[PDB]
Design an enzyme around this catalytic site. Structure first.
Site, PDB file in Angstrom:
ATOM      1  CG  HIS A  61     -58.096 140.968  31.016  1.00  0.00           C
ATOM      2  ND1 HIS A  61     -59.221 140.749  31.244  1.00  0.00           N
ATOM      3  CD2 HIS A  61     -57.688 140.745  29.868  1.00  0.00           C
ATOM      4  CE1 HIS A  61     -59.955 140.356  30.262  1.00  0.00           C
ATOM      5  NE2 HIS A  61     -58.894 140.239  29.176  1.00  0.00           N
ATOM      6  CG  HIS A  91     -49.203 141.528  35.020  1.00  0.00           C
ATOM      7  ND1 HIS A  91     -48.338 140.361  34.729  1.00  0.00           N
ATOM      8  CD2 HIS A  91     -50.177 140.916  35.906  1.00  0.00           C
ATOM      9  CE1 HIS A  91     -48.914 139.308  35.329  1.00  0.00           C
ATOM     10  NE2 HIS A  91     -49.720 139.449  35.987  1.00  0.00           N
ATOM     11  CG  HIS A  93     -53.329 140.876  39.614  1.00  0.00           C
ATOM     12  ND1 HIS A  93     -53.899 140.402  38.697  1.00  0.00           N
ATOM     13  CD2 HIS A  93     -51.957 140.329  39.472  1.00  0.00           C
ATOM     14  CE1 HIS A  93     -53.611 139.412  37.846  1.00  0.00           C
ATOM     15  NE2 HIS A  93     -52.119 139.417  38.216  1.00  0.00           N
ATOM     16  CD  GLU A 103     -54.176 137.551  41.001  1.00  0.00           C
ATOM     17  OE1 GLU A 103     -52.915 137.050  40.304  1.00  0.00           O
ATOM     18  OE2 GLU A 103     -55.064 137.543  40.290  1.00  0.00           O
ATOM     19  CG  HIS A 116     -48.504 138.508  39.621  1.00  0.00           C
ATOM     20  ND1 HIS A 116     -49.463 138.113  39.194  1.00  0.00           N
ATOM     21  CD2 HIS A 116     -47.714 138.381  40.751  1.00  0.00           C
ATOM     22  CE1 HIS A 116     -50.056 137.979  40.289  1.00  0.00           C
ATOM     23  NE2 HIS A 116     -49.115 137.966  41.366  1.00  0.00           N
ATOM     24  CB  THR A 195     -53.602 134.377  38.797  1.00  0.00           C
ATOM     25  OG1 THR A 195     -53.313 135.551  38.026  1.00  0.00           O
ATOM     26  CG2 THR A 195     -52.573 133.916  39.739  1.00  0.00           C
ATOM     27  CB  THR A 196     -55.478 135.929  33.798  1.00  0.00           C
ATOM     28  OG1 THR A 196     -54.164 135.868  33.184  1.00  0.00           O
ATOM     29  CG2 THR A 196     -55.517 137.006  34.854  1.00  0.00           C
TER      30      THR A 196
HETATM   31  C1  LIG Z   1     -47.921 133.562  29.843  1.00  0.00           C
HETATM   32  C2  LIG Z   1     -49.322 133.946  29.658  1.00  0.00           C
HETATM   33  C3  LIG Z   1     -49.456 133.413  28.148  1.00  0.00           C
HETATM   34  C4  LIG Z   1     -50.789 133.844  27.745  1.00  0.00           C
HETATM   35  C5  LIG Z   1     -51.717 134.686  28.352  1.00  0.00           C
HETATM   36  C6  LIG Z   1     -51.576 135.005  29.513  1.00  0.00           C
HETATM   37  C7  LIG Z   1     -50.258 134.693  30.064  1.00  0.00           C
HETATM   38  C8  LIG Z   1     -50.230 135.007  31.614  1.00  0.00           C
HETATM   39  C9  LIG Z   1     -48.920 135.439  32.261  1.00  0.00           C
HETATM   40  C10 LIG Z   1     -48.834 135.619  33.727  1.00  0.00           C
HETATM   41  C11 LIG Z   1     -49.960 135.317  34.409  1.00  0.00           C
HETATM   42  S1  LIG Z   1     -50.005 135.629  36.386  1.00  0.00           S
HETATM   43  N1  LIG Z   1     -51.069 136.790  36.470  1.00  0.00           N
HETATM   44  O1  LIG Z   1     -50.121 134.240  36.731  1.00  0.00           O
HETATM   45  O2  LIG Z   1     -48.500 136.535  36.264  1.00  0.00           O
HETATM   46  C12 LIG Z   1     -51.138 134.958  33.894  1.00  0.00           C
HETATM   47  C13 LIG Z   1     -51.214 134.693  32.551  1.00  0.00           C
HETATM   48 ZN   LIG Z   2     -50.548 138.314  37.478  1.00  0.00          ZN
END
Ligand SMILES: Cc1ccccc1-c1ccc(S(N)(=O)=O)cc1
Ligand SMILES: [Zn+2]
Length: 257
Positions: A61, A91, A93, A103, A116, A195-196
């Site tokens: 992703h 990471h 986007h 985003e 992020h 956001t995922t």
């Molecule tokens: C914190 C986490 C744990 C397990 C699976 C996904 C995440 C995670 C971390 C950061 C984001 S974002 N894109 O809001 O920075 C999304 C999911």
């Molecule tokens: Zn993110």
């Protein structure tokens, strides 16, 4: 299962993760004229001097750089936060073209990409426990526009060819994330979500006002990554962003006037 395509993208996520239609989902549009300046907000404290990067990974992703979060080495404090948040990973986007990819949006403007930096609250002991709490995570969001190169990004882009497809990882030690930060730490903040998937409503969002500039060559390297695993039909990793969600009963606060 979930992804960013027509049949498995953001519009489908609520079927497996019903919180997708919740009361504090992210990202959102930041309406700059409606955001309230809050003089009680403190400056952000970013203490990344002792950061220990470990690995870089294509997770199907995005790509992420992971850090040692077993000690208070790279922490975020202050700003709207109570207590101490350890950096776990960063990471990005990004889009298929420079006019989309972020985003969060600012007065409906989309940036080419969004960084992020993901931190979790040490009072919960581990990130899995933190994701179950309304103040569990703090994500520092930084917009990318295309222009001049960002020198501190180059070590990242130069190893992406080694993690082209889902599942690949590489050593990525001695990376200094301070090289990804803009001059100003002026920010907007609001309560939101990952956001995922799992889309958990556990995040204090801190979105910097000042974008960083990256070069077209740097972003082009992001766009050569693949969503697919090796041996599967090639599908470029582009447009891996969730669109803005309803603000509902939330106030965005600004640290600056
Ligand atoms: C914190 C986490 C744990 C397990 C699976 C996904 C995440 C995670 C971390 C950061 C984001 S974002 N894109 O809001 O920075 C999304 C999911
Ligand atoms: Zn993110």
């Amino acid at each position: 299962h979930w992804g960013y395509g027509k049949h498995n993208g953001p519009e489908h996520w609520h079927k497996d993760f019903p919180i997708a239609k919740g009361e504090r989902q992210s990202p959102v549009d930041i309406d700059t004229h409606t955001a309230k300046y809050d003089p009680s907000l403190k400056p952000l404290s970013v203490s990344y001097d002792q950061a220990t990067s470990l690995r870089i990974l294509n997770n199907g992703h995005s790509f992420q750089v992971t850090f040692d979060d077993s000690q208070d080495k790279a922490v975020l404090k202050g700003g709207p936060l109570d207590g101490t948040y350890r950096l776990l990973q960063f990471h990005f986007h990004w889009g298929s073209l420079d006019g989309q990819g972020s985003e969060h949006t600012v007065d409906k403007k989309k940036y080419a990409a969004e960084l992020h930096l993901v931190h979790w609250n040490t009072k919960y002991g581990d990130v899995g426990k933190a994701v179950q709490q309304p103040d569990g995570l703090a994500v520092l969001g930084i917009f990318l526009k295309v222009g001049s190169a960002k020198p501190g990004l180059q070590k990242v882009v130069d190893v992406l060819d080694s993690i082209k497809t889902e599942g690949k990882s590489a050593d990525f030690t001695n990376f200094d994330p301070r090289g990804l930060l803009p001059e100003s730490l002026d920010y907007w903040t609001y309560p939101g979500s990952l956001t995922t998937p799992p889309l958990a409503e556990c995040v204090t969002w801190i979105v910097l006002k000042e974008p960083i500039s990256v070069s077209s060559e740097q972003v082009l390297k992001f766009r050569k990554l693949n969503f697919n695993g090796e041996g599967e039909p090639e599908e470029l990793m582009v447009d891996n962003w969730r669109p803005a969600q309803p603000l509902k009963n939330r106030q965005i606060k600004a640290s600056f006037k």
